[PDB]
Structure formats: structure tokens, C-alpha cells
């Protein structure tokens, strides 16, 4: 699916977004959630726009005072970019969901923005705690709806195949 990847646009305001093409997905989560390693594992190599295959975008959203800057930035994208097919919400698999994670879920719901939960850092979860940590995520998010939750690791490759297959379905 992924063959060519180029960072083509760094946007500080909505007037800065490149023309919609043949598809678009985005990625967001807390700072230090492992978003960069994830994108790298996927690519296998402000709002930043990566041209993929010359016809789609993978959008790298800012990780969450400067708080209001981040706030306006993401909101203008969500409310103005109707060609957004899916937001991947990355949450640290090592701890229970964060208040701010649940707020993103609620916020995305009010705008009818489709999203998929992605658990990161699963290779850092101890054998004996994988179970307890997994339902903490499923039990908490499921009180907002019935969402797709993909356990992933950019180190072991867990979930990457499925994330890639989901993204191919959406865009192709």
C-alpha cells in the first residue's frame, strides 16, 4: 500500500491545507505517546501533511498558554476538512486512558468525526499485566460507544498489519 512518502505541507492555519486528493486519514494523541515511531513504522522509513502514493494524505496532528494554539489548530482541521476519513487516536497502552484522551473522544463525537483507538507501546507492557491493562482501555472507551481498538507496537510489529489494512480499505 505505502510506496512513496513525502512531507509536502506544514500548515499553521486552515488556509494552509493542500488540496484534497483521493483520501485522507489523520493521527493524533498526547505528546510522547509514540506517534512518531508509529508513523515511521507505517511509512517504514503545526499540522504536517504527508503525501502517500502521490494521491492520499496521512495527516500528523499536533500532540496535546500554548494550549489554546493547539486547540484552535486541531479544531479548524476537524471542522473544515470534510475529506477526513478517519482519525487514529493513539493512547499509551501502559496506563489507563487519560482524561484528555476521553475528551478527544467526546469532542470527535460531537463533530461526527470517525475515529479508531490505537494502543501504543504494547511491547513495554509486562506479560502479567497485559490482560488487566487491556480491559481498562476496552471498559472505559466502551462507555462512549462501540469502537475499534487496535493494540500496536512499532517495535514488535503488533497491530501494524491491521492498521495498514484498515487504512488501505479507507483510502483505496
Coordinates of C-alpha atoms in Angstrom, one line a residue, residues 21 29 48 59 72 76 85 97 102 108-110 117 129 151-152 157 160 166 170:
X21 CA -7.0 14.4 -3.1
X29 CA -2.6 11.6 20.6
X48 CA 2.1 18.2 8.8
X59 CA -2.0 13.9 8.5
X72 CA -7.6 26.2 17.6
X76 CA -10.0 24.2 12.4
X85 CA -12.0 9.7 6.5
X97 CA -6.9 6.2 29.3
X102 CA -11.7 10.8 26.7
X108 CA -14.7 13.9 17.9
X109 CA -18.2 12.5 18.6
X110 CA -19.9 15.9 18.6
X117 CA -8.4 3.8 19.0
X129 CA -0.2 -7.0 33.2
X151 CA -3.2 -2.9 20.2
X152 CA 0.0 -1.9 18.5
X157 CA 5.0 -5.1 14.6
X160 CA 0.7 -2.7 12.1
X166 CA -7.8 -0.5 7.7
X170 CA -10.5 3.5 3.7

